[PDB]
Design a binder for this molecule. Structure first.
Ligand SMILES: *[C@@H]1O[C@H](CO)[C@@H](O[C@@H]2O[C@H](CO)[C@@H](O[C@@H]3O[C@H](CO[C@H]4O[C@H](CO)[C@@H](O)[C@H](O[C@H]5O[C@H](CO)[C@@H](O)[C@H](O)[C@@H]5O[C@H]5O[C@H](CO)[C@@H](O)[C@H](O)[C@@H]5O)[C@@H]4O)[C@@H](O)[C@H](O[C@H]4O[C@H](CO)[C@@H](O)[C@H](O)[C@@H]4O[C@H]4O[C@H](CO)[C@@H](O)[C@H](O)[C@@H]4O)[C@@H]3O)[C@H](O)[C@H]2NC(C)=O)[C@H](O)[C@H]1NC(C)=O
Ligand SMILES: CN(Cc1ccc(Cl)c(Cl)c1)C(=O)Cn1cnc2ccc(N3CCN(c4nccs4)CC3)cc2c1=O
Ligand SMILES: [Ca+2]
Ligand SMILES: [Cl-]
Ligand code: NA
Ligand code: NA
Ligand SMILES: [Zn+2]
Length: 805
């Protein structure tokens, strides 16, 4: 019950929302069907439209009108946006030359530059160039402010997960809005675009910007708008709020547009019907800028123009149906469309097997336009697993396609020509970012970045301390004229040990064998210099990684590589080596095939053993530094140390051995040397964070040797590839991956073929930011460079995507 028989007189678009059963006049009341009886009359006036005309200039104030052209309107704060243009001979904002905003030029009483978020649904990145002739206000924002060529949304590339990601800096897995449609098994309730369930706070985690603002004494209301309030009224409302007295006036404002997504769905991303929605969004931006100029706020406010996701060509005939794969299709519930999420229809079924379903969906058709995954096996870059609302079975749907359960689901719901929600690396899913105002830089291009980063920037723009989030604070410092956040490197928590030769060969009982005892004083202090770290500047280019948790580990130096050896996990946390453009690939000699050597620097008790691998029929082993890239036959012996060995499934070894033997050399050839840091990752609970010892679910049979869930590599070179990796004076170039450590290659449908047909493609899918690797390892990389820390932060957030142009 709302006793909707109070009034909105003097209360239109009030900022504080009022408690029941007393009726509401806030910008959300229409959503709850709880507005006072007079809201439309008072708060949603439309009379005479949205523009001033000559015949309206200097009129007698008529309170019925949607906006005013009378003399008093400036001081009342409620002119039509074009008032100064029509009735004062002033020019539109878009027609003024763009002048650098060196300092905030605000009216008296403004304590700080207000922030205005202008968000646009389904605004694909390429619209910036492709729609440029019809969007002059937007193009002026772009060229005059700071802009990226695109901004990367989060997966799934749906509206709600992305807008709430913008507001919180959190992955959907952490904020809870994991889809446009969601079932929570605990709530036994469903969240939809339609309906009243979405209004419940229990779905929405994290701390949105407006709450971060309010708690630190910066005024801000919700970013939400009821859909029935037209766009013109939203602009006029924001402009009215901006006219409030200093102690009432909010510091942050948000405008939302359902366009161009709405038409995009009907007409496809580039349908001839798409020109008009783009025109209209530009007009709206123009109204806001004219309005700000009127209030002399146009060189005072910071404006963000930002989209939630792109739009792809998708039609009904491009639907894969699960009923073409499964016979038991009525046993399952599917979240359909541009992604798939499958769960049991009845939770009262103990004869329900996810394994059998995955298998029935795996590589079943040659053309297959989806790939099934257990959620923990999804690419770690998607960060799409750690939430009870995310189904164990996920379908990654190919761009341009849909998944549905049965044909009846499509025809009894062709309506659509456009959709979105695909993998966030997909070009068509990319969206937009423009920043304009005194705090942003002038006429500046920045590289593409992820929408998870914006929360921190908006906090900075408002003098707020950000709530804990998934951005890397400082990675977007290059967007801003004046910063206020100075990032610092996390302190190293564990200092390494530097062990010398401490054990005799006969102290080891590892069950290992090596054909090695084929024994000059010239070449003998030289070998000792390598174990002491003479070649360390060659192979460790950016300093040792800092271990950011409490542990026991040893630095181990060799001719060809250096490692950080964990006495707890019985393997390296990292292994660092440099392969120049000129270096040679050799083989593992016949006599050294099964060679594993005790490391006289590390105790029997802190070493792996060969017996464990013999007894484990599933588990083989591989090496972190590759023997194939030894600099000399004699240095090759170092690669076979027990301290360089890691557990590997035979199926995974196909992947690793091809990466090591072929790809590292290919990257060194193409990039003029590479530095490689490789290591294990443990993430049994799939939270995207380093597991502690007692979270490990699998060991090599009969041992304390823990089994990695993933293997990483960070591959760094000089951005200017005319300089070799090991002599590089300026910025760096990086690509990384996090390969899942799996006992089969079911993920790669062509894996029965030569590694050269499938291995590289898999690695590409599992591309990663260094930052992802840091969370997963508790390591901190690039500690010693000639580069600024902000630049290094940007580098750590880079993701090599592998998409075309
Ligand atoms: C992306 O950024 C975010 C934010 O920085 C990172 O996520 C954080 O990770 C932390 C570690 O995983 C986690 O800290 C824990 O908090 C626990 C209390 O959590 C509540 O309070 C906070 C603070 O206000 C709040 O944010 C949380 O909100 C969550 O929960 C509700 C649902 O109930 C949702 O509305 C909301 O969306 C959010 O859900 C998300 O997080 C939860 C986990 O909290 C997930 O389950 C969801 O899937 C979803 O992703 C909470 O309301 C607290 O219990 C923890 O303390 C334990 O661990 C410490 C370790 O030092 C130890 O000392 C203690 O012993 C303690 O153990 C005890 O509890 C155990 C479990 O109950 C029990 O087994 C033991 O026996 C002990 O009794 C811990 O401090 C933090 O909550 C989240 N924050 C958010 C917002 O998600 C995230 O990691 C980043 N991602 C990446 C990849 O880097
Ligand atoms: C599509 N857009 C745009 C949009 C803008 C910004 C973002 Cl961040 C997003 Cl995700 C979407 C809508 O605005 C649609 N729409 C409409 N009417 C609503 C009415 C009440 C709610 N509730 C959400 C939960 N809840 C919370 N209060 C504080 C924290 S969570 C109560 C309010 C939500 C809506 C709502 O979403
Ligand atoms: Ca973990
Ligand atoms: Cl969804
Ligand atoms: Na074995
Ligand atoms: Na396969
Ligand atoms: Zn949409």
């Amino acid at each position: 019950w709302t006793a909707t028989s109070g009034s909105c007189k003097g209360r239109c678009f009030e900022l504080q929302e009022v408690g029941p059963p007393d009726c509401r006049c806030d910008n959300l009341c229409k959503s709850y069907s709880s507005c006072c009886h007079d809201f439309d009359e008072l708060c949603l006036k439309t009379a005479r439209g949205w523009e001033c005309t000559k015949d309206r200039c200097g009129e007698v104030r008529n309170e019925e009108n949607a906006c005013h052209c009378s003399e008093d309107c400036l001081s009342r704060g409620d002119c039509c946006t074009n008032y100064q243009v029509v009735c004062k001979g002033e020019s539109h904002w878009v027609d003024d030359d763009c002048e650098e905003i060196k300092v905030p030029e605000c009216p008296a009483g403004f304590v700080r530059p207000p922030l205005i978020i202008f968000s646009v649904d389904g605004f694909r990145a390429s619209y910036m160039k492709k729609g440029s002739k019809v969007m002059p206000n937007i193009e002026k924002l772009r060229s005059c402010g700071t802009h990226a060529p695109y901004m990367r949304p989060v997966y799934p590339t749906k509206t709600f997960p992305n807008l709430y990601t913008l507001a919180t800096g959190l992955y959907p897995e952490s904020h809870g809005i994991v889809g446009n449609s969601m079932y929570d098994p605990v709530f036994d309730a469903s969240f939809h675009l339609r309906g009243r369930e979405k209004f419940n706070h229990r779905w929405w985690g994290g701390q949105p910007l407006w709450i971060t603002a309010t708690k630190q004494g910066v005024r801000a209301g919700t970013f939400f708008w009821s859909v029935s309030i037209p766009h013109e009224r939203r602009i006029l409302t924001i402009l009215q709020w901006l006219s409030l007295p200093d102690n009432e006036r909010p510091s942050v404002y948000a405008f939302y547009s359902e366009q161009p997504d709405f038409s995009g769905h009907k007409y496809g991303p580039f349908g001839p019907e798409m020109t008009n929605p783009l025109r209209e969004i530009d007009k709206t931006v123009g109204q806001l800028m004219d309005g700000l100029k009127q209030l002399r706020l146009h060189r005072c406010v910071n404006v963000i123009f930002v989209g939630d996701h792109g739009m792809e060509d998708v039609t009904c005939d491009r639907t894969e149906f699960l009923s073409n794969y499964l016979t038991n299709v009525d046993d399952i519930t599917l979240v359909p469309g541009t992604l798939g999420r499958i769960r049991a229809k009845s939770i009262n079924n103990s004869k329900y097997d996810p394994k059998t379903i995955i298998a029935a969906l795996t590589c079943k058709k040659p053309d297959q336009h989806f790939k099934p995954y257990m959620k923990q096996h999804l690419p770690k870059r998607l960060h799409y697993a750690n939430n009870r609302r995310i189904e164990d079975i996920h379908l990654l749907v190919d761009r341009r396609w849909h998944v549905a359960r049965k044909p009846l689901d499509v025809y009894k719901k062709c309506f659509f020509q456009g959709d979105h929600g695909f993998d966030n690396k997909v070009n068509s899913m990319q969206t937009v970012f423009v920043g304009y105002g005194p705090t942003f830089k002038y006429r500046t291009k920045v590289p593409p970045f992820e929408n998870i980063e914006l929360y921190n920037v908006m906090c900075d723009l408002l003098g707020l301390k950000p709530a804990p989030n998934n951005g890397t604070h400082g990675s977007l410092n290059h967007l801003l004229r004046t910063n206020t956040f100075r990032p610092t490197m996390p302190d190293e928590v564990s200092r390494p040990n530097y062990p010398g030769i401490m054990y005799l060969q006969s102290e080891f009982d590892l069950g290992c064998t090596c054909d090695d005892k084929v024994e000059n004083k010239l070449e003998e202090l030289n070998k000792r210099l390598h174990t002491k770290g003479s070649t360390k500047e060659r192979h460790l280019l950016y300093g040792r990684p800092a271990v950011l948790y409490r542990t026991s580990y040893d630095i181990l130096y060799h001719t060809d590589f250096e490692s950080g050896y964990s006495e707890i996990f019985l393997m390296p946390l990292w292994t660092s080596y440099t392969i120049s453009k000129q270096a040679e690939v050799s083989s593992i000699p016949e006599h050294l095939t099964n060679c594993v050597r005790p490391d006289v620097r590390v105790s029997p008790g802190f070493s792996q053993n060969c017996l464990a691998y013999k007894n484990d029929k599933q588990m083989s082993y591989g090496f972190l530094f590759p023997p194939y890239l030894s600099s000399s036959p004699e240095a090759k012996y170092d690669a076979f140390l027990v301290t360089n060995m890691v557990p590997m499934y035979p199926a995974f070894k196909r992947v690793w051995a091809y990466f090591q033997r072929v790809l590292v050399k290919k990257y060194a050839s193409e990039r003029n040397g590479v530095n490689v840091i490789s290591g294990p990752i443990f993430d049994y609970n799939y939270d995207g964070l380093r597991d502690t010892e007692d979270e490990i679910k699998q060991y090599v049979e009969g041992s304390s040797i823990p089994v990695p869930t993933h293997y990483y590599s960070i591959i760094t070179s000089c951005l200017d590839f005319t300089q070799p990796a090991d002599k590089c004076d300026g910025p760096l170039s990086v690509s990384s991956f996090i390969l899942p450590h799996r006992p089969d290659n079911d993920e790669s449908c062509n894996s029965s073929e030569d590694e050269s047909k499938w291995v590289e493609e898999l690695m590409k899918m599992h591309t990663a930011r260094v930052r992802d690797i840091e969370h997963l390892t508790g390591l901190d990389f690039y500690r010693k460079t000639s580069r600024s820390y902000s630049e290094i932060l940007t580098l750590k957030t880079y993701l090599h995507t592998y998409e075309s142009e």
